[PDB]
Design an enzyme around this catalytic site. Structure first.
Site, PDB file in Angstrom:
ATOM      1  N   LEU A  22       0.559  -1.243  -0.065  1.00  0.00           N
ATOM      2  CA  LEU A  22       0.200  -0.050  -0.012  1.00  0.00           C
ATOM      3  C   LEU A  22       0.980   1.156   0.141  1.00  0.00           C
ATOM      4  O   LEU A  22       1.660   1.486   0.822  1.00  0.00           O
ATOM      5  CB  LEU A  22      -0.876   0.021   1.195  1.00  0.00           C
ATOM      6  CG  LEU A  22      -1.564   1.320   1.416  1.00  0.00           C
ATOM      7  CD1 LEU A  22      -2.852   1.269   0.303  1.00  0.00           C
ATOM      8  CD2 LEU A  22      -2.316   1.525   2.743  1.00  0.00           C
ATOM      9  N   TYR A  57       6.891  12.306   3.773  1.00  0.00           N
ATOM     10  CA  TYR A  57       5.655  11.992   3.269  1.00  0.00           C
ATOM     11  C   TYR A  57       4.669  13.025   4.250  1.00  0.00           C
ATOM     12  O   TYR A  57       3.419  13.325   4.413  1.00  0.00           O
ATOM     13  CB  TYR A  57       4.828  10.774   3.320  1.00  0.00           C
ATOM     14  CG  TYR A  57       5.501   9.998   1.910  1.00  0.00           C
ATOM     15  CD1 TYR A  57       5.230   8.814   1.671  1.00  0.00           C
ATOM     16  CD2 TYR A  57       6.483  10.856   1.175  1.00  0.00           C
ATOM     17  CE1 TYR A  57       5.988   8.077   0.602  1.00  0.00           C
ATOM     18  CE2 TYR A  57       6.971  10.003   0.043  1.00  0.00           C
ATOM     19  CZ  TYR A  57       6.825   8.689  -0.216  1.00  0.00           C
ATOM     20  OH  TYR A  57       7.449   8.207  -1.216  1.00  0.00           O
TER      21      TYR A  57
HETATM   22  N1  LIG Z   1      10.377   6.283  -4.345  1.00  0.00           N
HETATM   23  C1  LIG Z   1       9.765   7.473  -4.942  1.00  0.00           C
HETATM   24  O1  LIG Z   1      10.585   8.316  -5.341  1.00  0.00           O
HETATM   25  C2  LIG Z   1       8.630   7.688  -5.026  1.00  0.00           C
HETATM   26  C3  LIG Z   1       7.884   8.652  -5.944  1.00  0.00           C
HETATM   27  C4  LIG Z   1       6.430   8.704  -6.170  1.00  0.00           C
HETATM   28  C5  LIG Z   1       5.583   7.735  -5.513  1.00  0.00           C
HETATM   29  N2  LIG Z   1       6.096   6.884  -4.516  1.00  0.00           N
HETATM   30  C6  LIG Z   1       5.461   5.637  -3.786  1.00  0.00           C
HETATM   31  O2  LIG Z   1       4.670   4.943  -4.718  1.00  0.00           O
HETATM   32  C7  LIG Z   1       3.150   4.980  -4.006  1.00  0.00           C
HETATM   33  C8  LIG Z   1       2.179   4.834  -5.345  1.00  0.00           C
HETATM   34  O3  LIG Z   1       2.446   5.848  -6.354  1.00  0.00           O
HETATM   35  P1  LIG Z   1       1.488   7.067  -6.417  1.00  0.00           P
HETATM   36  O4  LIG Z   1       0.873   7.407  -5.162  1.00  0.00           O
HETATM   37  O5  LIG Z   1       2.210   8.464  -6.996  1.00  0.00           O
HETATM   38  O6  LIG Z   1       0.224   6.985  -7.431  1.00  0.00           O
HETATM   39  P2  LIG Z   1      -0.597   5.558  -7.743  1.00  0.00           P
HETATM   40  O7  LIG Z   1      -0.418   4.551  -7.009  1.00  0.00           O
HETATM   41  O8  LIG Z   1      -0.429   5.606  -9.424  1.00  0.00           O
HETATM   42  O9  LIG Z   1      -2.013   6.316  -7.712  1.00  0.00           O
HETATM   43  C9  LIG Z   1      -2.457   7.626  -7.967  1.00  0.00           C
HETATM   44  C10 LIG Z   1      -4.012   7.806  -7.762  1.00  0.00           C
HETATM   45  O10 LIG Z   1      -4.667   6.557  -8.068  1.00  0.00           O
HETATM   46  C11 LIG Z   1      -5.974   6.586  -7.291  1.00  0.00           C
HETATM   47  N3  LIG Z   1      -6.510   5.242  -7.118  1.00  0.00           N
HETATM   48  C12 LIG Z   1      -6.217   4.029  -6.556  1.00  0.00           C
HETATM   49  N4  LIG Z   1      -6.776   3.099  -6.699  1.00  0.00           N
HETATM   50  C13 LIG Z   1      -7.542   3.478  -7.837  1.00  0.00           C
HETATM   51  C14 LIG Z   1      -8.311   2.408  -8.622  1.00  0.00           C
HETATM   52  N5  LIG Z   1      -8.565   1.266  -8.253  1.00  0.00           N
HETATM   53  N6  LIG Z   1      -9.119   3.071  -9.356  1.00  0.00           N
HETATM   54  C15 LIG Z   1      -8.976   4.453  -9.907  1.00  0.00           C
HETATM   55  N7  LIG Z   1      -7.978   5.394  -9.241  1.00  0.00           N
HETATM   56  C16 LIG Z   1      -7.452   4.636  -8.281  1.00  0.00           C
HETATM   57  C17 LIG Z   1      -5.677   7.234  -5.795  1.00  0.00           C
HETATM   58  O11 LIG Z   1      -6.984   7.886  -5.303  1.00  0.00           O
HETATM   59  P3  LIG Z   1      -7.623   7.567  -3.907  1.00  0.00           P
HETATM   60  O12 LIG Z   1      -6.490   7.548  -2.800  1.00  0.00           O
HETATM   61  O13 LIG Z   1      -8.811   8.399  -3.937  1.00  0.00           O
HETATM   62  O14 LIG Z   1      -8.111   6.206  -4.151  1.00  0.00           O
HETATM   63  C18 LIG Z   1      -4.454   8.002  -6.147  1.00  0.00           C
HETATM   64  O15 LIG Z   1      -4.581   9.232  -5.550  1.00  0.00           O
HETATM   65  C19 LIG Z   1       3.217   6.343  -3.462  1.00  0.00           C
HETATM   66  O16 LIG Z   1       2.105   6.551  -2.553  1.00  0.00           O
HETATM   67  C20 LIG Z   1       4.529   6.390  -2.522  1.00  0.00           C
HETATM   68  O17 LIG Z   1       4.290   5.262  -1.396  1.00  0.00           O
HETATM   69  C21 LIG Z   1       7.771   6.681  -4.470  1.00  0.00           C
HETATM   70  C1  LIG Z   2       3.635  11.292  -5.257  1.00  0.00           C
HETATM   71  C2  LIG Z   2       3.937  12.873  -6.059  1.00  0.00           C
HETATM   72  C3  LIG Z   2       2.884  13.787  -5.742  1.00  0.00           C
HETATM   73  C4  LIG Z   2       1.718  13.667  -6.663  1.00  0.00           C
HETATM   74  C5  LIG Z   2       1.947  13.078  -8.098  1.00  0.00           C
HETATM   75  O1  LIG Z   2       0.770  13.280  -8.598  1.00  0.00           O
HETATM   76  C6  LIG Z   2       3.024  12.646  -8.424  1.00  0.00           C
HETATM   77  C7  LIG Z   2       4.224  12.301  -7.599  1.00  0.00           C
HETATM   78  C8  LIG Z   2       5.335  11.736  -8.033  1.00  0.00           C
HETATM   79  C9  LIG Z   2       6.581  12.486  -7.680  1.00  0.00           C
HETATM   80  C10 LIG Z   2       6.625  12.307  -6.000  1.00  0.00           C
HETATM   81  C11 LIG Z   2       5.462  13.313  -5.545  1.00  0.00           C
HETATM   82  C12 LIG Z   2       5.504  13.579  -4.112  1.00  0.00           C
HETATM   83  C13 LIG Z   2       6.857  14.286  -3.493  1.00  0.00           C
HETATM   84  C14 LIG Z   2       8.145  13.378  -3.999  1.00  0.00           C
HETATM   85  C15 LIG Z   2       8.243  11.916  -3.227  1.00  0.00           C
HETATM   86  C16 LIG Z   2       9.595  14.027  -4.120  1.00  0.00           C
HETATM   87  O2  LIG Z   2       9.947  14.723  -3.290  1.00  0.00           O
HETATM   88  C17 LIG Z   2      10.171  13.354  -5.314  1.00  0.00           C
HETATM   89  C18 LIG Z   2       9.271  12.259  -6.027  1.00  0.00           C
HETATM   90  C19 LIG Z   2       7.784  13.068  -5.551  1.00  0.00           C
END
Ligand SMILES: NC(=O)c1ccc[n+]([C@@H]2O[C@H](COP(=O)([O-])OP(=O)(O)OC[C@H]3O[C@@H](n4cnc5c(N)ncnc54)[C@H](OP(=O)(O)O)[C@@H]3O)[C@@H](O)[C@H]2O)c1
Ligand SMILES: C[C@]12CCC(=O)C=C1CC[C@@H]1[C@@H]2CC[C@]2(C)C(=O)CC[C@@H]12
Length: 325
Positions: A22, A57
């Site tokens: 998650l 976060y």
């Molecule tokens: N290491 C890094 O640099 C980095 C960068 C970016 C992200 N991440 C990690 O990756 C995780 C996932 O990526 P992300 O949050 O950017 O985006 P994502 O998982 O691609 O999801 C984006 C949006 O999709 C919606 N969603 C979820 N399930 C859905 C479904 N079944 N149908 C339609 N919409 C749905 C959510 O809205 P609702 O919440 O309203 O359902 C959410 O705001 C993050 O939360 C974080 O832990 C890491």
């Molecule tokens: C989750 C996020 C915001 C909502 C969105 O729409 C797309 C992204 C992807 C890049 C994330 C960012 C959150 C802040 C992060 C963690 C950084 O400081 C570098 C990578 C960046």
């Protein structure tokens, strides 16, 4: 092999990781307090055993609250839960690594984290401000030294504060700088990067596989599409015609199809959702599979265009996205 009850895949260090977790990023300013805690608890009740978070976060304490309550409930044991934490750019100075991890352990109120990774290969000036810039809007960078930082990370494992080590947003050159390091003690076990049907990461995946590095796909659903970080120029992944058509074949949503796509290829997915219904929906990917042709159809959707370009840091010496991979 993969089922709701048992879906852990091997890591090169002898540990294992649940193929689905998650994600927990949510815009701080507009996200109600408690939404993360509630969501994590709903996920564990649902069947999730992996949670991805980060101190930056600003809700890492809520993840801890949820994990401890469920353990206290007797729902799971600490060993049943896998938590990934991250070391941010402003904390790459070697002597700052352990203190930074210890801070996260305080926040969570836990003894160790299962996975700790360097969040980005770029070093920023130390300090409380997560995004440092002077009065002229110029980013305050610091000199990177990936090998010295990695050694600091290895010390954290030796002290028992974390089980496995890894990286995030690293390209091939940055990975080999660590892999060929003299006296390497703990090689990276995983690399967290953007990965989905529009950006399949074909060359980086192949390279990592050759070195027993497991790829974790962040933004596996294509991001929340926030104009501040997302290249909104590329259309919404979940609206894709084919992905939606394929879903009708199994009575699954586009989201379910894209998640199954990556897990079926051995890629860990960490979709984020603070919605009860959606959290449950995203976990229902073990009651069906994609044919060999469908896997190829989905693969062909690759545009080699990222939703997350981080263009604001394009001039950092260690910007990861200039190279092909
Ligand atoms: N290491 C890094 O640099 C980095 C960068 C970016 C992200 N991440 C990690 O990756 C995780 C996932 O990526 P992300 O949050 O950017 O985006 P994502 O998982 O691609 O999801 C984006 C949006 O999709 C919606 N969603 C979820 N399930 C859905 C479904 N079944 N149908 C339609 N919409 C749905 C959510 O809205 P609702 O919440 O309203 O359902 C959410 O705001 C993050 O939360 C974080 O832990 C890491
Ligand atoms: C989750 C996020 C915001 C909502 C969105 O729409 C797309 C992204 C992807 C890049 C994330 C960012 C959150 C802040 C992060 C963690 C950084 O400081 C570098 C990578 C960046």
């Amino acid at each position: 092999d993969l089922s709701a009850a048992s879906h852990r895949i091997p890591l090169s260090d002898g540990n294992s990781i649940p193929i689905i977790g998650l994600g927990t990023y949510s815009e701080p300013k507009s996200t109600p307090k408690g939404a993360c805690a509630t969501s994590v608890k709903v996920a564990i009740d649902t069947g999730y055993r992996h949670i991805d978070g980060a101190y930056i976060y600003q809700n890492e304490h809520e993840v801890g609250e949820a994990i401890r309550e469920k353990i206290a409930e007797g729902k799971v044991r600490r060993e049943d839960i896998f938590y990934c934490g991250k070391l941010w750019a402003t904390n790459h100075v070697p002597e700052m690594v352990r203190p930074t991890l210890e801070r996260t352990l305080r926040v969570l109120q836990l003894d160790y984290v299962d996975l700790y990774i360097i969040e980005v290969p770029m070093a920023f000036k130390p300090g409380d401000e997560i995004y440092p810039r002077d009065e002229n809007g110029k980013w305050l960078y610091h000199k990177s030294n990936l090998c010295a930082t990695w050694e600091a990370m290895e010390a954290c494992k030796d002290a028992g504060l974390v089980k496995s080590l890894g990286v995030s947003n690293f390209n091939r050159r940055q990975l080999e700088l660590i892999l060929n390091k003299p006296g390497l003690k703990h090689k990276p076990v995983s690399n967290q990067v953007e990965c989905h049907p529009y950006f399949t990461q074909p060359k980086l995946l192949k390279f990592c596989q050759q070195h027993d590095i497991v790829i974790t796909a962040y933004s596996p659903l294509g991001t929340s599409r926030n104009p501040i970080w997302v290249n909104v120029s590329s259309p919404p992944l979940l609206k894709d015609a084919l992905l939606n058509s394929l879903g009708k074949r199994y009575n699954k949503t586009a989201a379910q199809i894209v998640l199954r796509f990556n897990i079926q290829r051995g890629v860990v997915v960490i979709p984020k959702s603070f919605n009860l219904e959606r959290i449950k929906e995203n976990f229902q990917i073990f009651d069906f599979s994609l044919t060999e042709e469908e896997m190829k159809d989905i693969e062909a959707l690759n545009k080699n265009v990222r939703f997350v370009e981080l263009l604001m840091w394009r001039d950092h010496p260690e910007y990861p996205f200039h190279d092909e991979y």
